[PDB]
Symmetry: D2
Subunit: 374 residues, 4 copies
């Protein structure tokens, strides 16, 4: 509902993609956003609908139903989707980027043919499992065991905070094969695999998050993803691309902030208010510029850990700040659950923690700068 | 649980008061804070308990059964209660300051004797109603014989659906045609709307009030007819001072949750409190806590001296409110994923804190007030 | 020099332009920056030099010696210039954009023929005089025959004492008209240069008009149409000027990064300290976001899109960020950062100008906030 | 004109009297030369005797030696009024009266205090404190030789360095808790000051390195015990921090002094933004005062904590810098000229985020303390 903004000239294809996703999001997602938050449940019908629109495999190969587009495209879809529901945006990102994109980049032809088509149609839901109760920030200290036994790897332990955890049919799981790390393709139907009950979160309540438990979970050796002991490389790259695409989550939240604020103020010319509005608009636009420039850079093949970390750092902090201003501009009404401003705040905060914290991002950028400039 | 902090030397009586309230808040209030947020309702049984401890009439005169203490004392009580549950704190503040203190300051002896005793014991709950959907207020009071008839609505009233006694501002003559009234829940033509569904302060019952030819005896005029603007202004100064201890208690709670976590959470082989960035974050929280406290206590003390503090009262609530919300965001940050779950109270602290940047006058209004007064005198 | 950062892929032409301008800047401007600041005087020889490089007419028509380039190119040139000396950059912006570009856009071909060639060669210096001590301007231009007679004053004029050609706004009826004024016109006089906190190499003065005769063929843009003329290119001015703060930010990293390796405390380069890494990260991210936003606005202008809000936005943003970054630069250097031996203090002093000169942050916020309704 | 509104803190008649006195001296005598001190890059030396005469130089010194015998709150108030007139004079004053005189008053033996305090208190002598070095891992050597310690090395960034007659100097008496503080006289052969530094601000505050080349120090000039220097240094830093925090206080008070009168007589929704900005300056001022005064009063009760001293200077220094930036903003073009003092307030304010230990160091100290306190 607030649609002014700087044109970035992303090209006809991406403009069409934007108009498409925006139409889909306003018609099919936005009406369910509040309900998803209130019921604490992802609206499952969206999986196939997004599959049918080609959003789920947007950066995956056209062999398997994918659209073969790039990270700028993915950012735009993620932004429109998150604009309608940040929760659906987060689940979508975790499926389409965390799971699908890692398989597409590190998977062998046989593996991709086996797992991708259903992930891309939305028949299967995907997840990525890296974090553990005692290994979050310090992720390489993970303790999930994977012991070779015949033509199988037996998995023992747990993962935590997994987006789409209770629903995922296919998961990319990192495990210690030598306490070092290996990535595995895990099916929900593998015996010894279980999901915990969904978490009760401050925000992202439409997004089903759970622990995972592995009790003698047998994984075929042909389901290793990217080679034994080479899980850390796979992980690292996975974090880069995660960072760029997920930074569009905050973008969508910021767009939603203006969506509620501007019409509100037009149904309800004070100067402090106009200044507040200006700061929101300018922030939104700068954040867009930065994220799109980083995404285009990734598409040209200049992926730097620095700038991906930087754009999610920046966008996440700005989205939270702006949600606070959205509530503020609405006043008392903004403090009620009758308006979505509160939910925008609750949702936005996740991005300063998930995908690595602000602290970890700042440190990565600092250490990297210092390392390359010596 | 986190008890580091600057000693402000408030004296033995205030130190003892802090000890009593802290004991009550930790033993009684904290274990039901989550429940209050979840059920979206005030735990009514607390009223009489707070009544018993002498907290509800803390600034009311001893002649009417109050404790006869001042705003510094009241800030301290409000802080310790808010630290345990910010919802309970807001309700308490609205009862004991917005209502009880307005009556203590402005009431004739007979109004005070009629209304104060049950408000002080907690048999009665109290509220204050000023704000409307549209001091250009529209609530109308017309004379009818020896009574006043009230017509209109008030919005966003803390303790609204439960209040037995209300201080209500109304137009008797449409500017300097405002009058304050003591209203009883019992008066016909008075009702409360449904309770609000809020981001935070969910344990604090809030609603609109609807006055439909509501009859108020002329003897219930509070502070003289046409004089409502003076009663309202003064009320606002004291309201801001006492309510600013709400953000203080929330800040204290941020430290309570974060500090034991910094010790107990290990990553990279170390408690995360040993990492430079986290030490910095902690330092900033601590310094902010102490500065906010210093400012608020100084303003309250000035009030107890009977000094002017309009700018300074607006200022200490502006300041505290903004800091508390910022600090709750950092508390969630410091706890990480755990801090993003409802199993931890950090999220609740954030949701509750934001209230004070709107409720009881917004940040914007506080800024404009302060700047205007400066630019004049 | 710190030359790392996001690639924006501006194209071969702009990249070659950046390279040439940077070579010129480090060779000819940078060694004079301190001296310009200490003597409070523009190094005049730079005019002809910049004229020889085609920089003064970068966005002006080729038929008059201009480069015929656009605002993105101009921002890049302005950025590389300001990175070597902010004062030189400010004077350069006033000459090449505020004066030359206004003539190029609103000047009749005869006027451009008369005034542009020397401005472009650098034989003449250009200025813009709009601001007055008090749309409430009081400089009056009275039509007496084939002449307009100018009486009044203008204030804070960049290149004031040196300008040969000035675009000058005046009230012809209280209503506004822009004029081309020559230094040689009798009744025109410049006041002594101001003594400023920063931008000390940039010669600012008041102007005084006492019965100054301007011929009617020197009306710029049409009688009573001065406000359209002004409004136009307040925008382009904002875009191009926002590259001043960009140059300064680049300069901040230019001084901070090397120092973070060389300085050692507690047995380590200070760059290994976590708070330091945090700070450097915030600087880097800010630099990239600001560049992204300014380049996007400039490219929008070059596509001929309207960008009132976004031009005001990008200078608002970039000016505030540059000042904050200069502060951190001083911080990162410690005691040394506090001495005039290092350039950090100068960068802070210079940066503050852009929040307060050529508009103010408050005006920019109100403008954006009003145009966004409200 | 001056801005004199603000929250009353009820500091008592003695302190209110001191405040009126110093504010009179500051606006009458110091303010008119603040720009001169800045432009000439030189402390106005004649101020020393005058501040001695007003009882300001030994404000926390024992009365038996001529001092006022007042405390840290009192000292903060004096520092604040002085700094409000000229931050440079305030920094030189702070270094003399707290960094030097107070260290001697707390750690000196009776004979040491008798010998050195009287001329420092009357302002006949200028005092300094020397601890920092270009490289507590300092390199300044003090080798015991007979009944004298021989000093070799250098100190850097010393306030009042070129002028100091008496300096408290820290050195390593054993490169293995091997630190000792010393009372050093300018008159000692082998001691000299370097050229005065050329600084962004605090330009009226003379700052230099010190150079000790086989500088002979009498062994009776050991301050507070051989090897005990780390203790002396640390406590010195706590009190340094509390009193110097009033430097930023004075700078903030100056910001309002320049802004509020200007905002009246200047006339063009930017003015509402302006009122908001004025509100934030006012509130910030009052908050910082409340905190600094609370920490100082705590010190006067005998409660000194590393945390709170560090905290109040961290807070105040950051606030003063931000407010100076706003003062310039509020005065617009005029604020950007050297004809108004706002530019100077900014340049000066920045110093307090570095000197006395950077904001980074303060944050770490506080965090490490809290962590130790809550394990
Ligand atoms: C909604 C949600 C969805 C998620 N989805 C997924 C998923 O799909 N896949 C997946 O693998 N994981 C997922 N996670 C896990 C997520 O990545 C973790 O929450 C986070 O990365 C790990 O932090 P933690 O929760 O262990 O907190 P901690 O790591 O304990 O952090 C606590 C605090 O300490 C700070 N800190 C830690 N180390 C340092 C240091 N060295 N220096 C300075 N400060 C430090 C942090 O900044 C933080 O403030 C999800 C989490 C959430 C909340
Ligand atoms: C928990 C809670 C308890 C409350 N309890 C009581 C009570 O007991 N008694 C009572 O009388 N009231 C009470 N209120 C009312 C409360 O004070 C109002 O909600 C608050 O003052 C804001 O009113 P509003 O919702 O109409 O905001 P609005 O006034 O609609 O605010 C809209 C936005 O515009 C801004 N704005 C408005 N006017 C201007 C202007 N002139 N210039 C610049 N900006 C402007 C505001 O900052 C705000 O961001 C309570 C509110 C809350 C939230
Ligand atoms: C280095 C430099 C170079 C310059 N070069 C040029 C040039 O080449 N050409 C040219 O025309 N001008 C030039 N200027 C003028 C410049 O645009 C002004 O100095 C400034 O942008 C406008 O503010 P002011 O100086 O008049 O101060 P004021 O506008 O008086 O500022 C006082 C404060 O009040 C606020 N305020 C300002 N106006 C209003 C209003 N109408 N209503 C409410 N509040 C308001 C502002 O936010 C400001 O913070 C230059 C200035 C500088 C410093
Ligand atoms: C005007 C002035 C007057 C002075 N007067 C005196 C005086 O009278 N007596 C005296 O003894 N000294 C004096 N000093 C020196 C002052 O104490 C030092 O400048 C300060 O203690 C340290 O600054 P530095 O130059 O050593 O910076 P550095 O130590 O080189 O610091 C460089 C940067 O690294 C950062 N850093 C360093 N260590 C760490 C860490 N462990 N973690 C994170 N970040 C870190 C710092 O924050 C800083 O940003 C004075 C200085 C000035 C500027």
């Amino acid at each position: 509902m607030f649609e002014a903004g700087l044109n970035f000239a992303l090209g006809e294809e991406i403009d069409a993609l934007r108009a498409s996703v925006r139409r889909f999001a306003s018609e099919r997602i936005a009406p369910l956003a509040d309900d998803a938050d209130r019921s604490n449940a992802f609206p499952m019908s969206l999986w196939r609908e997004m599959g049918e629109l080609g959003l789920l495999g947007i950066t995956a190969d056209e062999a398997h139903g994918g659209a073969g587009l790039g990270y700028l495209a993915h950012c735009v879809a993620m932004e429109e989707i998150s604009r309608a529901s940040a929760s659906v945006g987060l689940s979508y990102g975790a499926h389409s980027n965390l799971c699908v994109n890692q398989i597409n980049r590190n998977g062998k032809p046989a593996q991709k043919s086996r797992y991708l088509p259903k992930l891309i149609s939305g028949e299967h839901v995907g997840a990525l499992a890296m974090s553990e109760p005692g290994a979050g920030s310090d992720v390489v200290s993970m303790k999930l065991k994977a012991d070779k036994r015949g033509d199988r790897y037996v998995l023992n332990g747990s993962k935590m905070w997994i987006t789409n955890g209770p629903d995922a049919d296919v998961l990319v799981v990192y495990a210690k094969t030598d306490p070092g790390i290996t990535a595995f393709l895990v099916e929900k139907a593998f015996p010894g695999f279980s999901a915990g009950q969904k978490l009760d979160k401050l925000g992202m309540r439409g997004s089903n998050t759970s622990e995972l438990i592995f009790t003698d979970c047998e994984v075929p050796e042909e389901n290793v993803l990217g080679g034994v002991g080479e899980g850390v490389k796979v992980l690292m790259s996975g974090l880069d691309y995660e960072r760029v695409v997920l930074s569009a989550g905050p973008l969508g939240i910021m767009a939603a902030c203006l969506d509620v604020v501007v019409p509100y103020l037009h149904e309800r010319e004070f100067q402090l208010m106009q200044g507040k509005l200006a700061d929101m608009y300018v922030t939104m636009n700068a954040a867009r510029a930065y994220v799109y420039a980083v995404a285009a850079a990734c598409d040209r093949g200049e992926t730097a850990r620095k700038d991906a970390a930087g754009c999610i750092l920046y966008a996440a902090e700005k989205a939270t700040a702006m949600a606070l201003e959205a509530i503020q501009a609405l006043g008392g009404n903004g403090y009620t659950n009758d308006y979505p401003a509160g939910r925008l705040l609750r949702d936005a905060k996740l991005y300063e923690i998930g995908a690595g914290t602000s602290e970890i991002r700042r440190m990565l950028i600092g250490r990297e700068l210092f390392a390359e400039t010596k």
